[PDB]
Amino acid sequence: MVLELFARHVDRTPDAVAVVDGDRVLTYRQLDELAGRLSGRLISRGVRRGDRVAVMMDRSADLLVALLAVWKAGAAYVPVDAAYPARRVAFMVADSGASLMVCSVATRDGVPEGIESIVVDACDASAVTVRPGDLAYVMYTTPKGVAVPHRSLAELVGAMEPGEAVLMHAPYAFDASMFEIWVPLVWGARVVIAGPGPVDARRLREAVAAGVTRAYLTAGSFRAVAEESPESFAGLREVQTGGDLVPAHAVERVREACPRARIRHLYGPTEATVWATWHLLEPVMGPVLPIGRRAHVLDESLRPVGPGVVGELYLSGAGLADGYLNRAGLTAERFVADPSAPGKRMYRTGDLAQWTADGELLFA
Amino acid sequence: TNPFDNEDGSFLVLVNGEGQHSLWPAFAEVPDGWTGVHGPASRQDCLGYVEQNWTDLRPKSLI
């Protein structure tokens, strides 16, 4: 549970940096207090457990405050991107069923008509009880609202040292960026948010010099640096790409420059989330997916395929979302029953995979 | 094509203990912990039954 882990690091290291967003720098204590105050405001304006709050903010530093505040009220967070047209924004607020929208002064213009608005920019104490099944998020792909339980988010976060730093592009409504911002905070590390624009080799070299040990990068920037200077990746223990799986050539270039670096790609969508690590394949480097302690590769008859055969990937685990809001039929065809696990579901990725002779799960 | 996508297929509607519904191919064995609720029928008919009867997507264990 992100809130419970975050609270620990607020106790042990309150004065440690949590967010570095341009000019704005927030300690663990500051981020907690700002969220607590905004949480109280949400409770006053009528936010109750299980309610859904739409949030549309430019800056990441603000984004984190709103998030924790929503969770402190017991509510669920609906990320809205200021860029979306009002048709999108109005629909997402309608589908989610959000009564109130949290915004900044810059984004206040986007608030659809008939939505109560709170502006973060412009004391009562609550004590709420939450359970892992409660929703933490509603993430939209007409767009489909994916209901993400707190437990699913917990699996993804469930390793970094305190004071370690992760360089991340600005969080986006995209599934990748939205969950990543948590990972540093559960470990006591600090999010360092990249200035807008492609990450360049020098910015990467500058960031690692500042103490960044991990980087979450767009597929485009990774390929650019991989061509420009594979050596710039040196110093990073883990480099992670989001979006389209990067060409294998780029990954092999970066590996020759930095043999120690671990390259991963977050292929999964919000419904089922998968973290994949590039490894040298037996034939080369290829994406490898952890089986865990689960994944199935199944044929058209839903019977498990043999080793070396390609089949559709079904994912079963705690990370699976509850379903698509207001789309019961779609949830039923996508979140099918899992034969291996009683009373459980497996989510069809629509992605091909195959088993290696070693038993490692391989993307295709 | 995915079994759950095929329109020429006969399908079943399954429900687990949490009230969650799943389409299921008629040739497949029903997994343990899942119970059938709507006889062998077309893909659309089953989807209709789900849209009608699975009203609350929340797991039942959370009230």
Numbering used by the authors:
A (entry chain B): 1 to 122, 129 to 147, 153 to 169, 174 to 298, 301 to 310, 316 to 386
B (entry chain D): 2 to 64
Sentences from the study reporting this entry:
In this work, we have sought to understand the evolutionary history of lipid II targeting glycopeptide antibiotics (GPAs), a vital class of nonribosomal peptides used in the clinic for the treatment of resistant bacterial infections and exemplified by vancomycin (Van) and teicoplanin (Tei). Since ANC1-3 domains display polydisperse elution profiles in size exclusion chromatography, we instead turned to the characterisation of an Acore construct of the Hpg accepting A1 domain from Tei biosynthesis (A1tei), which possesses a homologous pocket to ANC1. The MbtH-like domain Tcp13 also exhibits the anticipated fold, containing a 3-stranded antiparallel β-sheet and an α-helix adjoining the centre of the sheet.
ANC4 was highly specific for D-Ala, with an activation rate of 0.89 min–1, >15 fold higher than activity towards L-Ala. Whilst unexpected, this preference is consistent with D-Ala being present due to cell wall biosynthesis and remodelling of the cell wall that occurs upon GPA biosynthesis. In this structure, the substrate binding pocket accommodating the small D-alanine is mainly formed by the three residues D196 (numbering for comparison to other structures; D190 in crystal structure), A197 (A191) and L287 (L281). The reduction in pocket size is largely attributed to the C296W (W290) substitution, with the increase in bulk displacing L287 (L281) and shifting the residue upwards by ~3 Å forming the lower surface of the pocket. While Y237 (Y231) is hydrogen bonded to the main chain carbonyl of G263 (G257) in the A1ANC2 and A1ANC3 pocket, this residue is rotated downwards in ANC4. This rotation appears to be facilitated by a hydrogen bond between the Y237 and the L261Q (Q255) substitution. The new Y237 (Y231) rotamer displaces F200 (F194) and allows for the loop and β-sheet in which G263 (G257) resides to shift downwards, thus further limiting the pocket surface. Optimising mutations then provided the route to the modern M1 A-domains that we see in Van-type GPAs, with Ala-activating domains undergoing further major reengineering to finally activate D-Ala.
